[PDB]
Structures are given as C-alpha cells and as structure tokens.
Design a binder for this molecule. Structure first.
Ligand code: ZN
Length: 46
C-alpha cells in the first residue's frame, strides 16, 4: 500500500506558513514578510 509519503517538492524555496514556492530565495524571503512584519502595533487579524 504505502498510502502516504506525503512529501513532494514543487520548488527549491518553499514556504511553510502558507505553502508557496519560489525559484529565487530572495523572492520567498520577501514573500514570507506577509506572515512576519515589523512587530507593528495593532490587532493581528486571524
Ligand atoms: Zn507563505
């Protein structure tokens, strides 16, 4: 059976916060920002 092996790869640099993929590390790095900002003051939505 082996009904599992849940571990594929679509792009070198992949995000864990949402699950996006980027070819150039930089790309993702800038993207991840969406998940982590600059400890801003305010109500963090869901
Ligand atoms: Zn992400």
């Amino acid at each position: 059976g082996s009904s599992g092996s849940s571990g594929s790869s679509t792009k070198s640099h992949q995000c864990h916060e949402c699950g996006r993929g980027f070819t150039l590390k930089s790309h993702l790095n800038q993207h991840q920002r969406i998940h982590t900002g600059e400890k801003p003051s305010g109500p963090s939505s869901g």
